[PDB]
Amino acid sequence: IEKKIVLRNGTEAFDSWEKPPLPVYTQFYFFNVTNPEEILRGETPRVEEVGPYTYRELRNKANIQFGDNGTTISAVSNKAYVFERDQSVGDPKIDLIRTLNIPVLTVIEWSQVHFLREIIEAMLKAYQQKLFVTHTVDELLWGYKDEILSLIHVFRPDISPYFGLFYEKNGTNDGDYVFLTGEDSYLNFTKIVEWNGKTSLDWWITDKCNMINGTDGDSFHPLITKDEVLYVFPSDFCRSVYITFSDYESVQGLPAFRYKVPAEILANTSDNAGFCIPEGNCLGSGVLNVSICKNGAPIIMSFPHFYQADERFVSAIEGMHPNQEDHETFVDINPLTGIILKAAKRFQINIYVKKLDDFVETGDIRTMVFPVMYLNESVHIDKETASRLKSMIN
Ligand SMILES: *[C@@H]1O[C@H](CO)[C@@H](O[C@@H]2O[C@H](CO)[C@@H](O[C@@H]3O[C@H](CO[C@H]4O[C@H](CO[C@H]5O[C@H](CO)[C@@H](O)[C@H](O)[C@@H]5O[C@H]5O[C@H](CO)[C@@H](O)[C@H](O)[C@@H]5O)[C@@H](O)[C@H](O[C@H]5O[C@H](CO)[C@@H](O)[C@H](O)[C@@H]5O[C@H]5O[C@H](CO)[C@@H](O)[C@H](O)[C@@H]5O)[C@@H]4O)[C@@H](O)[C@H](O[C@H]4O[C@H](CO)[C@@H](O)[C@H](O)[C@@H]4O)[C@@H]3O)[C@H](O)[C@H]2NC(C)=O)[C@H](O)[C@H]1NC(C)=O
Numbered sequence: 001i002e003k004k005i006v007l008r009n010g011t012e013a014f015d016s017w018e019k020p021p022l023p024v025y026t027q028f029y030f031f032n033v034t035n036p037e038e039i040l041r042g043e044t045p046r047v048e049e050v051g052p053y054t055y056r057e058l059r060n061k062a063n064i065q066f067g068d069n070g071t072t073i074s075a076v077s078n079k080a081y082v083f084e085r086d087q088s089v090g091d092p093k094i095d096l097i098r099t100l101n102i103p104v105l106t107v108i109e110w111s112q113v114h115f116l117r118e119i120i121e122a123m124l125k126a127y128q129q130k131l132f133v134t135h136t137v138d139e140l141l142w143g144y145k146d147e148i149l150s151l152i153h154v155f156r157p158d159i160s161p162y163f164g165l166f167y168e169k170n171g172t173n174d175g176d177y178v179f180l181t182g183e184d185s186y187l188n189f190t191k192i193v194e195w196n197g198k199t200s201l202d203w204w205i206t207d208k209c210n211m212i213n214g215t216d217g218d219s220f221h222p223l224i225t226k227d228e229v230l231y232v233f234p235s236d237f238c239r240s241v242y243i244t245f246s247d248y249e250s251v252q253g254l255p256a257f258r259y260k261v262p263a264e265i266l267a268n269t270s271d272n273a274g275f276c277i278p279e280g281n282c283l284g285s286g287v288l289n290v291s292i293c294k295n296g297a298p299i300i301m302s303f304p305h306f307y308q309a310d311e312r313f314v315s316a317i318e319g320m321h322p323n324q325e326d327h328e329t330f331v332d333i334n335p336l337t338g339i340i341l342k343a344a345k346r347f348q349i350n351i352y353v354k355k356l357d358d359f360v361e362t363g364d365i366r367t368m369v370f371p372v373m374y375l376n377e378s379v380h381i382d383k384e385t386a387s388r389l390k391s392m393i394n
Pocket residue numbers: 112113114118119277278282283289290291292293296298352
C-alpha cells in the first residue's frame with residue numbers, strides 16, 4: 001500500500017511532485033520604524049507592523065534527472081511570486097516602509113572584517129548616508145539601486161549595486177538538489193542526500209551542526225507516527241531543523257498530526273553551540289546568526305516578534321508582541337500519506353545594529369537585534385483536492 005508513493009515517472013506522486021497541485025502563499029510583514037532619530041540618540045526603538053502583502057507561489061521542479069539504480073532523483077525547484085492586491089493591505093509599489101539602511105550596514109561589516117576592502121570606506125565619507133531610509137515595499141524585497149553599492153560597483157564590478165531581501169529570487173531555483181526516491185525504503189522518501197553537489201554544510205563550526213538532515217519540508221515519508229521526529233532542511237534558513245508532535249487535527253475529512261518547531265531549535269544550548277561562528281560565543285536563545293549564508297551581512301534570523309526566544313530581545317524593541325498562535329510555525333500532515341494538508345511556516349529577518357565610533361551613521365544607537373520583516377509561508381488544502389486525495393483504497 002505504501003509502495004504507491006515513490007518518485008518515478010509512472011506514479012501520481014511524481015506528477016504532483018513535478019507540478020504541485022496546491023497553491024502556496026507567502027505574506028510579507030514589515031516593521032515601520034516610528035522614531036529614527038531618537039533611535040540614533042540611544043532611545044528604545046519603536047515599530048509599527050505593516051502587512052500583509054500577498055504573493056502566490058508558482059511551483060514546478062526542473063532539470064529532473066534519474067538515479068544510480070532507481071534510488072535517486074535530482075532536480076531544481078523554481079518558485080515565482082505573483083502578487084494578489086485584494087488579499088493585501090495595499091499596492092507595494094506605492095506603499096512605503098522605513099527601516100535600517102541595510103546595504104550600508106553590510107559594507108560597514110565589510111569594513112571591519114574585509115570581504116571587500118576597508119579604505120574604500122572612503123566612498124562612505126565622500127557621500128553622506130543615513131542608517132534609516134524609506135523605500136517602497138516592492139523595493140526592499142524585489143530590489144533597488146543603492147548609491148554606495150553603485151560606486152563600489154565601479155571599482156569592483158563583481159559586487160551588484162542592487163540590494164533586496166528577495167532580490168532576484170522571482171522565478172529562480174535555489175540550489176541543485178539530489179533527492180532520495182522511495183525505492184530503497186519509503187522512509188527515505190524525498191530525503192536530501194546532497195545539495196549544491198556537496199552532501200554537507202561548510203558554514204558551521206561543528207560536524208553535527210553542519211549535517212543535512214531530512215526532507216526539504218514540502219513533503220514527507222508515508223506512514224508517519226506520533227512518537228518520531230521529522231527533520232527538515234530549509235535552504236533559506238541556512239541550517240536543518242526538526243519538528244515535534246503537538247496535537248491531533250482534522251483538516252477536511254482527513255486526519256493530521258500537528259508538528260511544530262520546538263523552542264529548542266534556535267535556543268542557546270551546547271548541542272547548538274556550532275551555530276555560533278565565533279565558538280563559545282553566540283547571541284542567545286531564539287536567534288541565529290545567518291551572516292555567512294548571506295554575503296557577510298549582519299543578518300539575524302528569528303521567529304516572528306521573537307517568539308520562542310529570550311525575552312530580553314522582545315523588550316529591547318517596542319512593538320514586539322509575540323504570541324504562540326500567530327507566530328508559531330506548524331505542519332499538519334496526513335499520517336498515512338505524509339502529504340501536507342495544512343501548514344504555516346514563519347521566519348523573521350533581523351539586522352544586528354550597534355554603535356561604532358568609526359562610523360557616525362550608527363550614532364549612539366543601542367546594541368540590539370533589530371526587526372525588519374517576517375513572513376507566513378502558508379498552505380491550505382482545497383475542498384476538491386481533499387476528496388480525490390480522500391479517494392484511496394483505491
Ligand atoms: C555572525 O557571523 C559572522 C560570520 O558568519 C561573524 O563574522 C565574523 O566576525 C568576527 C568578529 O570578531 C571576525 O573576527 C575578526 O576578524 C577580523 C578580520 O580578520 C581578517 O583580517 C585580518 C586583517 O586583515 C589584514 O591583515 C594584515 C594586516 O592586519 C595584512 O597582512 C592583511 O593582508 C590585511 O591587511 C590588508 O589590508 C590593509 C588595509 O586595511 C592593507 O593596507 C594591507 O596592505 C593588506 O592588504 C587578518 O589578520 C585575519 O587573518 C586571520 O585569518 C586568516 C583566515 O584565513 C588566517 O589565514 C590568518 O592566519 C589569521 O588567522 C588568525 O590570526 C588572527 C590575527 O588577527 C587572529 O584573530 C586569529 O587567531 C585568526 O585565527 C583575517 O584575514 C580580525 O581582524 C579580528 O581580529 C582582531 O581583533 C582581535 C580582538 O581580539 C585581535 O586579537 C586581532 O589581533 C585583530 O585585531 C577578528 O578576528 C570574523 O572575521 C568574521 N568572519 C566572517 C566570516 O564574517 C559575525 O561576527 C557574527 N555576528 C555576531 C553578532 O555574532
